[PDB]
């Protein structure tokens, strides 16, 4: 039978992205189901082995998947990962694209902390979106994990903490729907952009869609133009209309950070923690699903 790493039987394809396809796998040693990421060794610029190095640097952190195997086999670079549960996009769709305020805030607390942890390891993620957060399995079903480090990169030197330099004239990196305003302006990404994207993810959960989503265009180059224009023409206060002011406060805070500024991860958590209490919610791990 076909087994990557001589050990993981290949199952059905479960996803595809710019940096490889994802398949179900089964560890013949334990029967443990796993996720197998494959990248063609002929790829323009190989990326999976670098992604694997990032995962290894983050191991042990709360909500970081464990990497089981990395190697080259046949026409593929291989990365075998612990299998997690459904993504937040999967669960959002399962829940008919409605999340309660309580679920949004339960998620927001952990997602801010996941992003802070990555930053604490000197990296920015650069692709914050609902598909890239997965709940844990079984007992760990209460824990939000972050995945997909294919666009991640160091933003400061590990020893000196010298921040990467500012620059403009960059092409869009990440996803158009969730990218920060400064990313659309061609500015180098930094810590603030991961958190701004999260702010759009949270308002997406509240609304079911974002106002720049589903725009009619022609080229994908002009697709980005219509998205950038709508995102810039929609004030944060209009975006967040009908929802607690904390969501606009969060987004305004992120937009006001300077390029190399350390975000106040505690302030942002307390905004939505204070709201959680005002609402009368308890942190009892009861999500909409």
């Amino acid at each position: 039978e076909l087994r990557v790493g001589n050990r993981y039987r290949l199952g059905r394809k479960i996803g595809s992205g710019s940096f490889g396809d994802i398949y179900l796998g089964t560890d013949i040693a334990a029967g443990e189901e796993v996720a197998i990421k494959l990248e063609c060794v002929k790829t323009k610029h190989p990326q999976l082995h670098i992604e694997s190095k990032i995962y290894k640097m983050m191991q042990g952190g709360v909500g970081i998947p464990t990497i089981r195997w990395c190697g080259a086999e046949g026409d593929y670079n291989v990365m075998v990962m612990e299998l997690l549960g459904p993504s937040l996009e999967d669960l959002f769709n399962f829940c008919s694209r409605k999340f309660s305020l309580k679920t949004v805030l339960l998620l927001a607390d952990q997602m801010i902390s996941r992003i802070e942890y990555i930053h604490s390891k000197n990296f920015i993620h650069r692709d914050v979106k609902p598909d890239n957060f997965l709940m844990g399995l079984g007992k760990k079903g209460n824990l939000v994990y972050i995945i997909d480090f294919g666009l991640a990169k160091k933003y400061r030197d590990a020893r000196t903490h010298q921040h990467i330099p500012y620059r403009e004239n960059k092409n869009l990196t990440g996803t158009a729907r969730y990218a920060s305003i400064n990313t659309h302006l061609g500015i180098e990404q930094s810590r603030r952009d991961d958190l701004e994207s999260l702010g759009y993810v949270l308002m997406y959960f509240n609304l079911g869609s974002l106002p720049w989503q589903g725009l009619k265009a022609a080229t994908k180059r002009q697709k980005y133009e219509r998205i950038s224009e709508k995102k810039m023409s929609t004030p944060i206060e209009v975006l967040c209309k009908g929802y607690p002011s904390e969501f606009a406060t969060y987004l305004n805070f992120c937009r006001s950070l300077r390029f190399d500024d350390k975000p106040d991860y505690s302030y942002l958590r307390q905004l939505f923690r204070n709201l959680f209490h005002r609402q009368g919610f308890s942190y009892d791990y009861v999500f909409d699903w």
Binding site: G17, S18, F19, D127, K129, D131, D148, G150, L151, K170, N171, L172, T173, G174, T175, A176, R177, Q213, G214, L215, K223, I227
Partner: peptide, 7 residues
């Protein structure tokens, strides 16, 4: 609009 884009 949801594709992962690189630099």
């Amino acid at each position: 609009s949801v594709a992962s884009l690189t630099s």
